[PDB]
Design an enzyme around this catalytic site. Sequence first.
Site, short mmCIF file in Angstrom:
data_model
loop_
_atom_site.label_atom_id
_atom_site.label_comp_id
_atom_site.label_asym_id
_atom_site.label_seq_id
_atom_site.Cartn_x
_atom_site.Cartn_y
_atom_site.Cartn_z
N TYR A 127 -12.74 -1.36 -4.65
CA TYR A 127 -13.26 -0.09 -4.15
C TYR A 127 -14.31 0.52 -5.06
CZ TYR A 127 -9.92 0.31 -0.35
OH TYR A 127 -9.33 0.17 0.87
N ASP A 146 0.71 -1.27 0.00
CA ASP A 146 0.00 0.00 0.00
C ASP A 146 0.74 1.33 0.00
OD1 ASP A 146 -2.92 -0.99 0.38
OD2 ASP A 146 -1.81 -2.03 1.92
C1 LIG Z 1 -8.61 1.59 5.64
C2 LIG Z 1 -7.29 2.16 5.23
N1 LIG Z 1 -6.27 1.16 5.49
C3 LIG Z 1 -5.72 0.84 6.81
C4 LIG Z 1 -4.52 1.75 7.07
C5 LIG Z 1 -5.77 0.38 4.52
O1 LIG Z 1 -4.93 -0.48 4.76
C6 LIG Z 1 -6.20 0.51 3.07
O2 LIG Z 1 -6.51 -0.78 2.64
C7 LIG Z 1 -6.67 -1.02 1.25
C8 LIG Z 1 -7.46 -2.12 0.84
O3 LIG Z 1 -7.64 -2.41 -0.36
O4 LIG Z 1 -8.04 -2.75 1.74
C9 LIG Z 1 -6.11 -0.16 0.35
C10 LIG Z 1 -5.41 1.13 0.79
N2 LIG Z 1 -4.21 1.26 0.05
C11 LIG Z 1 -5.05 1.09 2.24
N3 LIG Z 1 -4.77 2.47 2.73
C12 LIG Z 1 -3.57 2.77 3.21
C13 LIG Z 1 -3.37 4.20 3.69
O5 LIG Z 1 -2.67 1.95 3.25
#
Ligand SMILES: CCN(CC)C(=O)[C@@H]1OC(C(=O)O)=C[C@H](N)[C@H]1NC(C)=O
Lengths: 388, 388, 388, 388
Positions: B324, B70
């Site tokens: 998403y 991420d």
């Molecule tokens: C709910 C946001 N969070 C937890 C930090 C996530 O891990 C998100 O998850 C996902 C995901 O697909 O679950 C994608 C995003 N790239 C993540 N955002 C960040 C900032 O890393």
Amino acid sequence: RDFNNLTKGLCTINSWHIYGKDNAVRIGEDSDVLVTREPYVSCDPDECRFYALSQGTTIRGKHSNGTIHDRSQYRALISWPLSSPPTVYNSRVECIGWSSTSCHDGKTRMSICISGPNNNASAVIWYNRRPVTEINTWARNILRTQESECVCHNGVCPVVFTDGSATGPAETRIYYFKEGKILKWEPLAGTAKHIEECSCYGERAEITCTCKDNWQGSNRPVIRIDPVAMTHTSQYICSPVLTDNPRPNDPTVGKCNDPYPGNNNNGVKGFSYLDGVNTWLGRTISIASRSGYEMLKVPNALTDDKSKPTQGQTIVLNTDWSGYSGSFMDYWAEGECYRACFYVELIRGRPKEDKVWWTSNSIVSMCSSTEFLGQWDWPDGAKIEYFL
Amino acid sequence: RDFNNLTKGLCTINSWHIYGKDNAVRIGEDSDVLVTREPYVSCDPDECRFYALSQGTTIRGKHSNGTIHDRSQYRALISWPLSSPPTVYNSRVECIGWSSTSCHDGKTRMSICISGPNNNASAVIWYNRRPVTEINTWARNILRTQESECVCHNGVCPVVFTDGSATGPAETRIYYFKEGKILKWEPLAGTAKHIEECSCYGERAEITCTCKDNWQGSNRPVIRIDPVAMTHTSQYICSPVLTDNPRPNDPTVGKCNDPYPGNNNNGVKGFSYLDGVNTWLGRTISIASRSGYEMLKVPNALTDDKSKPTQGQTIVLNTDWSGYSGSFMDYWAEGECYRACFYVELIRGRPKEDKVWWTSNSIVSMCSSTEFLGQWDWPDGAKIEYFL
Amino acid sequence: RDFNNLTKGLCTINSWHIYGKDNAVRIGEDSDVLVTREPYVSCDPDECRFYALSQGTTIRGKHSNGTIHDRSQYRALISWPLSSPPTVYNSRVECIGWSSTSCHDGKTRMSICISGPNNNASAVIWYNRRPVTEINTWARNILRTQESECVCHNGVCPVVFTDGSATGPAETRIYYFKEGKILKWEPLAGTAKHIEECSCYGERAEITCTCKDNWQGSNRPVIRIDPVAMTHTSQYICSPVLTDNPRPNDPTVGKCNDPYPGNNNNGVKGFSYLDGVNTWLGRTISIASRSGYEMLKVPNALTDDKSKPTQGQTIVLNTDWSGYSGSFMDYWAEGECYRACFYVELIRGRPKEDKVWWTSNSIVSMCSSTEFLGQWDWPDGAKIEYFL
Amino acid sequence: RDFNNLTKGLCTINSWHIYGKDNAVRIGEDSDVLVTREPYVSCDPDECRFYALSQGTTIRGKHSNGTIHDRSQYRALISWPLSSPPTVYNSRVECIGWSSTSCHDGKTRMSICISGPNNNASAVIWYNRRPVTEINTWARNILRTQESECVCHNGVCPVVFTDGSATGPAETRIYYFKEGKILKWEPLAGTAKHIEECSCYGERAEITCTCKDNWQGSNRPVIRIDPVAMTHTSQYICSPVLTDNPRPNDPTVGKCNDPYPGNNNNGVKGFSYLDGVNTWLGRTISIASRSGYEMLKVPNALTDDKSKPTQGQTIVLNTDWSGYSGSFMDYWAEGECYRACFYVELIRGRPKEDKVWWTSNSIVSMCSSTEFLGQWDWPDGAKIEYFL
Ligand SMILES: CCN(CC)C(=O)[C@@H]1OC(C(=O)O)=C[C@H](N)[C@H]1NC(C)=O
Ligand SMILES: *[C@@H]1O[C@H](CO)[C@@H](O[C@@H]2O[C@H](CO)[C@@H](O[C@@H]3O[C@H](CO[C@H]4O[C@H](CO)[C@@H](O)[C@H](O)[C@@H]4O)[C@@H](O)[C@H](O[C@H]4O[C@H](CO)[C@@H](O)[C@H](O)[C@@H]4O[C@H]4O[C@H](CO)[C@@H](O)[C@H](O)[C@@H]4O[C@H]4O[C@H](CO)[C@@H](O)[C@H](O)[C@@H]4O)[C@@H]3O)[C@H](O)[C@H]2NC(C)=O)[C@H](O)[C@H]1NC(C)=O
Ligand SMILES: *[C@@H]1O[C@H](CO)[C@@H](O[C@@H]2O[C@H](CO)[C@@H](O[C@@H]3O[C@H](CO[C@H]4O[C@H](CO)[C@@H](O)[C@H](O)[C@@H]4O)[C@@H](O)[C@H](O[C@H]4O[C@H](CO)[C@@H](O)[C@H](O)[C@@H]4O[C@H]4O[C@H](CO)[C@@H](O)[C@H](O)[C@@H]4O[C@H]4O[C@H](CO)[C@@H](O)[C@H](O)[C@@H]4O)[C@@H]3O)[C@H](O)[C@H]2NC(C)=O)[C@H](O)[C@H]1NC(C)=O
Ligand SMILES: *[C@@H]1O[C@H](CO)[C@@H](O[C@@H]2O[C@H](CO)[C@@H](O[C@@H]3O[C@H](CO[C@H]4O[C@H](CO)[C@@H](O)[C@H](O)[C@@H]4O)[C@@H](O)[C@H](O[C@H]4O[C@H](CO)[C@@H](O)[C@H](O)[C@@H]4O[C@H]4O[C@H](CO)[C@@H](O)[C@H](O)[C@@H]4O[C@H]4O[C@H](CO)[C@@H](O)[C@H](O)[C@@H]4O)[C@@H]3O)[C@H](O)[C@H]2NC(C)=O)[C@H](O)[C@H]1NC(C)=O
Ligand SMILES: *[C@@H]1O[C@H](CO)[C@@H](O[C@@H]2O[C@H](CO)[C@@H](O[C@@H]3O[C@H](CO[C@H]4O[C@H](CO)[C@@H](O)[C@H](O)[C@@H]4O)[C@@H](O)[C@H](O[C@H]4O[C@H](CO)[C@@H](O)[C@H](O)[C@@H]4O[C@H]4O[C@H](CO)[C@@H](O)[C@H](O)[C@@H]4O[C@H]4O[C@H](CO)[C@@H](O)[C@H](O)[C@@H]4O)[C@@H]3O)[C@H](O)[C@H]2NC(C)=O)[C@H](O)[C@H]1NC(C)=O
Ligand SMILES: *[C@@H]1O[C@H](CO)[C@@H](O[C@@H]2O[C@H](CO)[C@@H](O)[C@H](O)[C@H]2NC(C)=O)[C@H](O)[C@H]1NC(C)=O
Ligand SMILES: *[C@@H]1O[C@H](CO)[C@@H](O[C@@H]2O[C@H](CO)[C@@H](O)[C@H](O)[C@H]2NC(C)=O)[C@H](O)[C@H]1NC(C)=O
Ligand SMILES: CCN(CC)C(=O)[C@@H]1OC(C(=O)O)=C[C@H](N)[C@H]1NC(C)=O
Ligand SMILES: CCN(CC)C(=O)[C@@H]1OC(C(=O)O)=C[C@H](N)[C@H]1NC(C)=O
Ligand SMILES: CCN(CC)C(=O)[C@@H]1OC(C(=O)O)=C[C@H](N)[C@H]1NC(C)=O
Ligand SMILES: *[C@@H]1O[C@H](CO)[C@@H](O)[C@H](O)[C@H]1NC(C)=O
Ligand SMILES: [Ca+2]
Ligand SMILES: [Ca+2]
Ligand SMILES: [Ca+2]
Ligand SMILES: [Ca+2]
Ligand SMILES: [Ca+2]
């Protein structure tokens, strides 16, 4: 519209936030990215763009072999949209040559490219994308310039050139251009003993250039220019926090008017913002190689020979390659002050990574924040192994 | 020209017509397409464009290996022409970071990108393509934002951030920006117990955000904002038609002010249009994974804890990967009402398709029609086998 | 500025000069060119561009396998600069779908794309690059339209659609749009028994469409529209010079109000300029396949059932593949008359060249000259062997 | 705005500075660069661009095989940003054909492309990017034109065409166009015995064209045109400094009104600036092949049959391939005089480098300086070995 005038002072630098990063080498592993070096950033009134000296070949192209060399007939100053990589398809050629500078005066842009053999180079000054003036080598020894943006005030855009030896006294000149034409030029004066690749910025009608004494100094020479009187002075950053590379270890007292000794005939283009207590210095972390990069707040660095850091921010880890660095600011931003910015050239390939036959780089740039922001490191990010 | 004001109500949603699809993964199998995730769509007064978080590498490039991660220093918010893929050559970088939001206020655009390590991230607010404001992490735990467009009214553009744990109570704030500067911020209030990645839209001077309770809720939290008073409230969608993923099976009665239990510490960014009988909910078809996607008309979903569907439309088959989804509308279209739109991220690669070492996605987006249109399914369309 | 009005008559067609050719298949053998079919050309007041239905993949890409198929969720109407090929990087998506039409009304452009499964398709009418109106299938059998540009007069832009069987009587409608909204629609009237893919042009406030009777006719049906009264008539080209393909050999007398028999359930989109003695017909050279292409001056073809050629010009040799052809004119050119133009789709790949697994095409287009110019043939030019 | 008028005289040419270089062949070794030949440069009031005849294929593409051939249906005049290479993605097609010319009249641009078989070619004159006039072959033997920019004065843009034998007397015509329409045409008059590919420039209301006598002359024919009277004269450069290629060795006295003998039926497009003492001649260094390139100041070359060089500048070493060369100037630059410029086509591949199956080129161009600048050589720079 009207010529831009340096009417503001610098904003208070409490930290540095990320401004642009192109991840050029990573992306170029599988796309048409030009091999470059000697990058910088420069703004127009309506847009800020990345600049660099292309090598006239893509990184994956077979002609990338040999790109460690500095001056060939295949180089050119190119510019491209902020944070994009320099690709064959989005790069705009400003002029042909192996050394350059460029700046917008408020009305239009002036770009300068020098080309030629070592004993017969010539600069050609472009304004409004047309060639206007040409200057022939005066010392017949690699006529060369800044490698970062120049700065203008009421139409006057000073540029520092050097011609002659890089390991001995040389012939440095400050040219004052207006609409691409020469208004006047001076020989370098002051106590700086050797000038190479000046990094400049302007504030409150004064232009400050932090350059490189390739000959003897590990501290940086500084040229302050009055673009109205068209006069200048020169000295060195007094601080014991030495900022050239390679360099000796830091002493407890620096030198104000002589090169700080310890390392000869070598150095890296660098920069600094000299503004009383609001003074920040950039330098590689390694005293031995173009490795790592950090910003250090050294109050009164220019004039205090015992000045040491009071705050700092790491930009690139010492376990990552860096390279040239220089200053630029968006003189057309909103607000009451000019936000100091800089870029760091992240060199990949030769000479440090010789498993590949090319040398290129990517760019990371930051600008100041009045907040005290958390820090992160910003490496090039490419895996050389992938290129093998 | 002048700041846009949310003066219209939503058009009646009788069905959804195809708006944009970029077929990015298909096309990128043999062309220079950037690896992305966390896409969205956002309009300017004269153009609507796709947006996403690039991974700083092409899909076929060797650096695509590892893109399931991420937050890296190689990510950036990029935008590109509607329905084109995000290529190295047509993608415009808005800012550097691994979490973002962006919206046009009528005069110019505000883009926000957050970057940094987990305990020291910082947001930088860009307006008119220049950095204006910076906000340092307040809870030192992955400062993060919407991942879809924000909405403005008379210059005021509220944005929801979260900092702290994703599996426990956290520190969510609603910032109200005007020309990239902070006018005010609030802590989250209301009954929503945890907020992540809000999807927002505006109508008749009210901004509605459907977010994600990653901690405990399978029903979605909702934040309604008054951008004039600069105040807000929070609750959950009352409906038993649960819209997070993973999630329990639908009950016959939902929860209005607490998370609906059954699944902890997980969820997907999603959205909804809450407008009395003109209420439509989006959700994955699978209750177990980011698979399939459908739109369901659930009259009075927000306030009726027994509301069930009265009409529906499948967008992606349960035999195809989704991801998403969020809302956006063209606030500068002709007509007397705002046409609700949304996009669905079609994730390919890891973790579900691990024969490849990358993770990316393509985009499909629809907008409402007052007609009762026939439906079709819209999968990503790429064959993973081709990438092996 | 103001709505364009068809105030001029056609220029005298004494020959055809080369207008545009993109050499797409040749070039795409080693560059990122999208696989397409159903191309056409259309002008705006300040630019003329090529258009086509992309297949959502490059020709060299592995997803090119299967592109012989007509309707998938990966197709989209794209436009790109005249005579360039449709590349991933210069193609602009107008809308999503597998059947389309598009035209500029003087102020802005209207684009229509139909998508959906066979029994549930829907058209969405875009105007000024925004979705405005949607029409649901009325016969539940492949709702479809022109595949070439529509024509406007004082804001009114008629478009011919067909829904229902391609091998039996069907439900054809003429819609009259203004600013993307429906002013009125009619059922097809006249003696044309089946309408498919109309090719249209306008002159002196009348719009003439030469279509295709896929069911029974080898002669072409013609729909003449009055865009002021918003009424129309239909008949067939009376001439014995048959212009559909496949087709029987030419008779000595044609049919004015019935399909000319001999070949059922097949045909190719084609066109003609019906203007008394200034009448020219386009047709494939082969009566058996989409091979070759020629223009024939057949004075009074529309109304004279014994009309035979008086002049001619070969466009593509019978030893080269052709395909669809249609009309367009630059209604914003200088001069006192409208210069008739047309394009010919040069299909490569399947079904005729099955050593490759794809089907695509390139475009060649000509416009009339009042001179009697020498002729040349214009093949696609690619060597299939290179793709193996 | 208003038609440009040739009101200035030439600037004094004391040397030549580098203006543009695209390094096309080098770069094209690993990127989508079109194969070209017959390049030139031409300016609009707000931009200067490179031009050339594409071969309708990339250099690395398999269709590059055979590109040594001159006239095919796959060629087109394309233009692209100065110093960029001609890529599939940044090249703009001006018109279709295998021989061309183009020039801006101050208001808009006129482009001319000729196409057809040898005995039935036709020119089509485009103005403001639309086809306006067409001219059919008059001698039925490869109708052809300049291959470099034409020049305009008060709307009148003369162009020199030739039709008929290249190794015998032929039918050369000077057409005077205004807004793409023919105002008048003349047969060639004067003492020039054969005209091919004229290189032109204008100053003080007179247009000078240096052409090529392919039939008998090793000295160059010159056509001086009065674009107001629409009349012209012709003669040869009197100088013994012979400038065609191949050619005999220089004599001590040249010929003013006859071809200088020694070599028949061969030659290279070239140019010169004839301005009294401010006279400079371009020529290949080799008298045997298109090898090397130099500029020689030969005061009064046009009228003095014993004129020999007084100064010189090497552009390309005799150990590097050259090719066509022609003149252009930026008539919209600031200043009181027109700065003479020229480009040299650097041919690579066949026939001289037959290990590859293609023939293409790159471009280098220079403009004059009133300074006496140091010189450098400017080769193509690609390694043929890499293409094997
Ligand atoms: C709910 C946001 N969070 C937890 C930090 C996530 O891990 C998100 O998850 C996902 C995901 O697909 O679950 C994608 C995003 N790239 C993540 N955002 C960040 C900032 O890393
Ligand atoms: C979240 O983010 C925040 C924001 O960034 C993080 O907080 C920051 O933390 C930084 C790292 O700690 C810190 O940076 C340092 O600041 C020091 C100055 O502050 C201290 O001194 C002042 C002055 O008395 C006090 O006011 C203040 O309270 C502090 O005590 C600098 O001195 C530091 O730089 C020196 O150390 C680094 C290594 O850490 C060297 O690389 C650097 O070159 C400096 O040290 C060399 O140079 C000096 C001067 O000559 C020498 O004396 C010294 O021996 C070193 O010399 C050797 O090394 C150099 C370089 O290799 C070589 O040339 C020479 O020859 C010798 O070999 C450093 O800059 C930030 O200021 C701080 N920011 C803020 C707002 O607080 C926070 O940690 C993050 N949070 C988490 C959880 O990680
Ligand atoms: C041509 O195009 C048209 C236009 O699209 C096509 O017509 C459409 O057809 C659609 C499919 O039939 C239809 O969509 C459905 O509408 C239903 C509502 O309409 C019906 O009920 C109302 C209310 O009484 C009546 O007015 C009306 O007349 C109808 O009778 C929805 O209820 C449907 O959604 C439910 O089913 C689908 C599967 O079909 C599920 O995926 C969806 O989630 C819904 O069901 C789940 O959720 C509910 C609510 O909690 C549960 O009760 C139920 O058990 C299901 O729960 C399980 O599954 C979910 C999801 O997996 C899981 O979370 C849960 O835990 C359980 O496991 C559906 O939306 C359109 O409305 C209709 N449109 C129009 C204009 O007519 C036409 O068919 C096409 N023509 C051709 C020839 O194909
Ligand atoms: C340099 O350039 C110039 C400019 O282009 C060249 O000059 C041109 O030359 C062209 C070719 O000769 C010529 O084109 C022909 O024109 C004919 C009409 O002109 C003649 O008749 C009139 C009428 O009486 C006279 O006024 C005039 O003086 C001429 O005598 C057309 O009739 C020709 O088309 C027919 O033949 C071609 C094959 O050549 C077929 O492909 C075409 O379909 C036509 O023939 C079929 O159709 C007719 C009508 O039904 C049938 O009767 C006939 O049997 C054929 O039918 C079979 O074939 C078709 C198609 O396959 C099939 O469907 C059917 O079932 C049957 O199997 C042709 O168009 C230009 O007009 C002329 N232009 C000018 C300005 O002069 C010049 O040659 C070039 N120079 C050099 C040196 O090359
Ligand atoms: C740094 O940069 C500067 C700036 O460029 C460099 O200085 C330049 O140096 C140049 C090279 O020396 C010089 O160029 C030459 O100028 C000569 C004219 O100047 C001399 O004569 C005049 C007249 O009396 C004097 O005023 C003046 O003071 C000088 O003495 C030219 O004549 C030269 O061209 C001839 O030679 C070259 C080879 O050098 C040939 O390629 C060229 O074609 C010319 O010679 C052929 O043609 C003539 C005329 O017919 C014949 O007489 C002769 O025999 C040759 O003929 C053969 O070869 C040709 C071509 O192959 C073939 O067709 C024929 O059949 C025969 O086989 C040359 O142009 C610059 O002017 C000078 N610039 C300045 C401002 O000073 C400086 O060196 C650089 N510094 C460093 C350190 O490198
Ligand atoms: C095409 O025809 C319509 C008239 O039908 C012209 O429209 C008039 O234009 C002027 C200036 O726009 C207005 O004041 C009239 O009221 C307009 N319309 C009508 C419908 O009466 C239009 O200008 C013509 N187009 C062009 C290019 O001349
Ligand atoms: C080039 O010359 C022509 C005069 O021959 C100039 O044309 C005149 O321009 C003004 C303003 O456009 C008109 O009112 C005159 O009638 C124009 N023409 C003629 C033909 O008499 C033209 O302006 C000049 N070009 C430039 C850039 O100054
Ligand atoms: C200080 C400038 N000099 C000495 C001539 C250099 O060698 C520079 O070194 C470096 C360098 O990375 O050290 C890069 C520049 N490409 C060189 N500039 C030129 C004009 O070649
Ligand atoms: C006449 C239109 N029909 C019958 C539905 C076709 O099959 C067309 O055929 C052809 C064709 O080349 O024959 C191409 C079009 N892609 C098809 N159109 C659609 C909508 O699929
Ligand atoms: C002098 C013009 N001729 C004779 C027809 C040429 O062959 C030219 O030669 C050359 C050449 O390099 O010699 C290149 C041009 N592509 C040719 N022009 C045409 C129209 O084919
Ligand atoms: C190129 O074309 C020639 C002649 O057709 C053929 O013999 C040759 O093998 C081809 N070369 C390649 C590399 O295709
Ligand atoms: Ca490639
Ligand atoms: Ca040094
Ligand atoms: Ca959840
Ligand atoms: Ca038929
Ligand atoms: Ca000759």
